[model samples]
Target: MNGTEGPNFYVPFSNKTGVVRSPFEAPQYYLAEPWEFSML
Candidate 1:
């Protein structure tokens, strides 16, 4: 006798990995400068 199998339910990424990284810092620029306005 030939029969079919039932549907399988396999989930992925069920667990999370603990990872940490350094914070990001942005530089301060002067937008009031004449050259900065020209670019806009």
Candidate 2:
């Protein structure tokens, strides 16, 4: 897990619909950025 710093990593759910897609679905993050957008 990435902490609050200049840059770090993060993981996010890959669900689009409001309802739960599936129980065995692999969650994933769609994007990544520095800890502070304004810093870059």
Candidate 3:
């Protein structure tokens, strides 16, 4: 996404004419799944 943030996720879509595309649009899921770390 941006320079400050690390890598994000990708969205998989299916077309009606039997086709698939990975445009990864609407980068809005950033708010839902955030990155975290731990030392366990």
Candidate 4:
């Protein structure tokens, strides 16, 4: 998640919880679930 070569992934935790807010950024480049590519 810098200058180039993206498909980057970032996971930030809550200031208190210290847990993954989401999980992964795969959806930003790859696929999260097959349903995301619906209407194909």
Candidate 5:
């Protein structure tokens, strides 16, 4: 991956610490907006 860009999909790891812990490793207390929902 380039420094100016990131994965198109969500990654289950940290970009800073490069660590993969629980699914809730990153921020998860925020509400998901309507536009953020996945299409069926």
Candidate 6:
């Protein structure tokens, strides 16, 4: 669980769809804001 400063660890786990595409390109920030980009 991260806070204010944001995700201390930027090592994103590539989603199945992103595997054949780009690394860290999961759209995680949009689809799963509360799960990934939740800075609160």
- Among these predictions, the greatest lDDT belongs to 6
Task: Tell me each candidate's RMSD, in Å, in order.
Answer: 23.8, 10.3, 11.8, 10.8, 10.7, 7.9
TM-score for candidate 5, please give it: 0.15
| Model 1 score (lDDT) | 0.18
lDDT against the true structure, each candidate: 0.18, 0.26, 0.24, 0.27, 0.28, 0.35
Query: Lowest-lDDT window of 10 residues in candidate 1?
Result: 12-21
Model 1 regions more than 4 Å off: 1-28, 34-40
Which 10-residue window in model 4 sums to the lowest lDDT? 12-21
Error of 6 at 14 (Å): 6.4
**Candidate 3 lDDT, 12-35, residue by residue in tens:** 212211221124332334422122
The residue-by-residue lDDT of candidate 1 on 8-40, one tens digit each, is 222211111111111211113321221211221
Model 6 C-alpha lDDT per residue in residues 1-40, reported as the tens digit of each score: 2422233335333232244224444454433332343422
Could you give me the TM-score of model 6 versus the true structure? Answer: 0.16
TM-score of each: 0.14, 0.15, 0.14, 0.18, 0.15, 0.16
lDDT by residue (tens digit), candidate 5, 1-40: 2231134335422343233223542344422221122110
Ranking of candidates on lDDT, top first: 6, 5, 4, 2, 3, 1
Q: Which stretches of candidate 3 lie over 4 Å from their true place?
A: 1-22, 31-40
The TM-score, computed over Cα atoms with residue i paired to residue i, of candidate 3 is 0.14
Q: Which should have the higher lDDT, number 3 or number 4?
A: 4
Clashes in candidate 1: how many? Answer: 0
Writing each residue's lDDT as its tens digit, candidate 2 over 1-40 gives 2322223223323222123323323233213322222111
